[PDB]
Structure 1
Amino acid sequence: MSSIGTGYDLSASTFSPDGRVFQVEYAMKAVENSSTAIGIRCKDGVVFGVEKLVLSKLYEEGSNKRLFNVDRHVGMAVAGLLADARSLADIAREEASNFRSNFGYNIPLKHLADRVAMYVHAYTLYSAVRPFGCSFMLGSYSVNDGAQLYMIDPSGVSYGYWGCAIGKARQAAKTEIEKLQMKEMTCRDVVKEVAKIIYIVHDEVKDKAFELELSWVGELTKGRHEIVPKDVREEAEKYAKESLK
């Protein structure tokens, strides 16, 4: 990049000789430093999985929320710095909340991903506010497209994914998703499998323990978005530990 003493990396309404702002790139490192969020598109729903690091042994699930329920059919799984994740969560919740209430049907995702990414990007343009140093995914079950999963980067670029991972081992996680067929597989089986990828990522010589938050929006819940039921949640983690060894 550059480390010029006036602007370019110290502002973000200033483009480099090539046309890029260094400030968004510094932010892009931030998703890499902490734990992964995986999310794969099914066709009966979407299954999300974020490993929440047990930093303190005096926490309970619902602490350092990486998993948000955006609406009652829309999820958001984030990776990277949690403060920029919260902002992104707040905007997403309001955008989803007006659409169910008013229209009366489930939100087609592809527009939603574009709007939120517009929000990210509008802030990048400005030098008065910051690029968002989070990468996040949105997932929904719709009656106009079925399941959709889109991943939006800290740059405000939106692409749809059959199966994504954003986090501290994208390369290892994406590849495991490639091998498996989860693209059009049933949500129930997927729960176990998403957890199992989280198990590979996690180390018992870089992490102590994590608490699994998965989120359903699929056939068990009848398309309702809830954070994983305690029985199911446990079952899926139980499989993850047992199958490696």
Structure 2
Amino acid sequence: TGYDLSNSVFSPDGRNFQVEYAVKAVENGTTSIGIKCNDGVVFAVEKLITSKLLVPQKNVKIQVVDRHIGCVYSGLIPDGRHLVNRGREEAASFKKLYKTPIPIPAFADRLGQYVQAHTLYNSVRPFGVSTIFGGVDKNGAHLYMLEPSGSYWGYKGAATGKGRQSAKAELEKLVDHHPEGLSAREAVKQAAKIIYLAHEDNKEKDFELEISWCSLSETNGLHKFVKGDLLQEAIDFAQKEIN
């Protein structure tokens, strides 16, 4: 034993226990989801209201990369911010050299390689976040989810955090009941519902809903936050479904 004391050490299983311990930090975090729709993607996240003293709508969790990519994550919030800062540098250098905005699969690997690099040495710690991200590019809509190991895949729907099992079950129903696809405005409504349903795992403290989206028709392929009437419409739809 002692194989779990240092990062980048293979155990006799062939496992990196330090990365597996980073996953525990992710599982401890709040719920966040992603939904791939007809011509874009929708992101949503659970924000726990620790106290009345928290200013509503101010502590924003979802982050934009470039102008067409959205990023949300569960786990250690600072680690997620560090990853997004890197993502922004990666996207900037891509656009600098190649002119076109970075494609989503291309962007996904840039994060993947960077996270994977933090499993190669004992002088660094793995990332304590699973990141759900995506957007619209020349080839259409893309949704991805990236783990502490550096592992990522494309997704129809994605979920992580403390209420991931509840969310995953809800996402699986949508995939089955909508083979032809889901619209952007529908996805926002469904996203709200799923976060509310996933909140049963964090039911002690009340929460604040935060949604964003990229859509070719609704947002011209740019990342925007869901605000005002459209946000309230999604909250009402979500509240109606739980009752």
Structures share fold, TM-score greater than 0.5: yes
Report what 1:92 is aligned to. Answer: 87
Q: Which amino acid aligns with 1:228?
A: V
**What is the percent sequence identity of the aligned residues?**
50
Distance 1:220-1:109 versus aligned 2 partners, 3 A rule: same
Per-residue CA shift, 1:137-180, capped at 9, x if unaligned?
A: 1211011x201011111110111111101111222211211111
Report what 2:52 is aligned to. Answer: 57
2:208 to 208, 211, 214: 211
Q: More deviation in 209-218 or 196-205?
A: 196-205
Report what 1:193 is aligned to. Answer: 190
CA distance in 1, matches of 2:87, 2:171: 26
Report the TM-score when normalising by structure 2.
0.91
Contact preservation (8 Å) 1:74, 1:96: no
The answer on 1:130 being equivalent to 2:128 is no
Contact preservation (8 Å) 2:87, 2:110: no
1:178 to 164, 172, 176: 172
1:231 to 220, 229, 232: 229
Q: Which amino acid aligns with 1:62?
A: K
Residue-pair matches, total: 238
CA distance in 1, matches of 2:20, 2:174: 32
SS of corresponding position for 1:124: coil
Per-residue CA shift, 1:82-118, capped at 9, x if unaligned?
A: 1211111111122223334554434321122122111
CA distance in 2, matches of 1:207, 1:236: 23
Q: Which amino acid aligns with 1:196?
A: K
The answer on 1:23 being equivalent to 2:21 is no
CA distance in 2, matches of 1:172, 1:212: 17
Per-residue CA shift, 1:164-208, capped at 9, x if unaligned?
A: 011112222112111114673110111010110111111397233
CA distance in 1, matches of 2:228, 2:166: 28
CA distance in 1, matches of 2:228, 2:210: 10
SS of corresponding position for 1:120: helix
Report what 2:143 is aligned to. Answer: 149
Structure 1 residue 69: Cα displacement = 0.8
Contact preservation (8 Å) 1:191, 1:236: yes
Residue ranges of structure 2 left out of the alignment (5+ in a row): none
Contact preservation (8 Å) 2:132, 2:159: no
CA distance in 2, matches of 1:38, 1:31: 13
Report what 1:244 is aligned to. Answer: 242
SS of corresponding position for 2:43: strand
CA distance in 2, matches of 1:142, 1:13: 35
Report what 1:105 is aligned to. Answer: 100
Contact preservation (8 Å) 1:107, 1:140: no
Distance 1:233-1:100 versus aligned 2 partners, 3 A rule: farther
User: Where has structure 1 moved over 4 Å in runs of 4 or more?
Assistant: none
Report the TM-score when normalising by structure 1.
0.90
CA distance in 2, matches of 1:113, 1:94: 13
